[PDB]
Amino acid sequence: KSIPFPLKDIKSVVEVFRQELRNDQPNLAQLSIVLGFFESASTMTPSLDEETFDALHCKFMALLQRDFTFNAGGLPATREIVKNVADLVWGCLAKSYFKDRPHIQNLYSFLTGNRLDCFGVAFAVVAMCQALGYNDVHLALSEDHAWVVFGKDKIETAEVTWHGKGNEDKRGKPVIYQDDDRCSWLYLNGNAVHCTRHMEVASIISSINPNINHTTDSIQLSQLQQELLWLLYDMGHIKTYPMAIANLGDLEEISPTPGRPPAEELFKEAITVAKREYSDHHIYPYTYLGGYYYRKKKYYEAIASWVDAGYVAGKYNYSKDDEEMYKEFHEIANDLIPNILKDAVAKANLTSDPKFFALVLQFYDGICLWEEGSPTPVLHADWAKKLVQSIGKFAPECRSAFNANTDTLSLRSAKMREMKNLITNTSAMKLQLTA
């Protein structure tokens, strides 16, 4: 019992994390309860007393003591045990809440209101396995999904949570790389983040949500998250975790910490990590950096980064499962690129520059590759409209220069290669883009 209750300031919370992170087995349940308490109170002085903390711990342990026994011999977990723990979690959830509500990612929400989001479920399963002494059970994270790995002599995998509307129940099933027609972004072609216990602590810090409303975040909770991410960073626990590094980049962009690297270098670090450890199969590190450049009005840099993102997306085969990445690219294509071009046309630059025009086409090239052979299309009539409007904002001599240079042969998708040849009208281009 080392926690000085009541916990009623950021410094005290960081100190609980500091102490637990020193250990081989940071207490996942305890840490999620504490963070969740503060997130709920801050996004509605928050003070967590000993009575409340003990009641939540009691309740968590009582849920497990019902049908599980501790792994006294240190055996590896089995598929049956993992599925059974997922079944417990799922069985405790309330039936009538919206699964994509914010602030329901942690064990506080689970224990006080029987609500968890899909990431929360997967974390819960791992935290319960830890409590039971199955320390082979770990979280695996893609960019928009989570599952578990377990076993000692043979590493095995199991689905434990839902994705999207959860119409398909996969509890206990292997994550296997097959479905050979289709390589899904959700599973990163095998380049998921496999967490140590310290990285599982990082996942709950990284998933802190300071949003109160669309225009207001909790400064206190943002400060807590930024401080905790620096702690993880400094002690080496997010060296292989791109989204945790990128989320820190986002925090530093908004509130730079004296003596720390610039946000831009943190974004580049997350990219370097992705390239080095994850076969350059992650998309978000490129869209985080692209977004940064966009907000800094560094438009050459922004589009180059979005092109990197598109060509990563092009490593995959699109499905409706990919809706979060769809939304990101939809905004880039339909809002942000047009914004850049409107600003540039607003001054008379990049609208006469074949190198810039090339990069715009390469962005759509990567999206086109992503969609190749998919039953469901990505580029609908609205994306087509916007692409043809965008192309129209470039100089005629700029476009024809693009056709006469090396960058012409660089396009890889059948759709964009067929498109460039409609250059020397709008209706034929629009039709081609949605074929």
From TrEMBL:
CDD domains: Menin. Keywords: Chromatin regulator, DNA-binding, Nucleus, Phosphoprotein, Repressor, Transcription, Transcription regulation. InterPro entries: Menin (IPR007747). Pfam families: Menin. Transmembrane segments: none annotated. The keyword Nucleus applies. It comes from the Eukaryota. One of its GO terms (molecular function) is Y-form DNA binding. GO terms for cellular component: chromatin; histone methyltransferase complex. It is found in: Nucleus. GO terms for biological process: chromatin organization; negative regulation of cell cycle; negative regulation of cell population proliferation; regulation of transcription by RNA polymerase II. This is Menin. It comes from Nematostella vectensis (Starlet sea anemone).
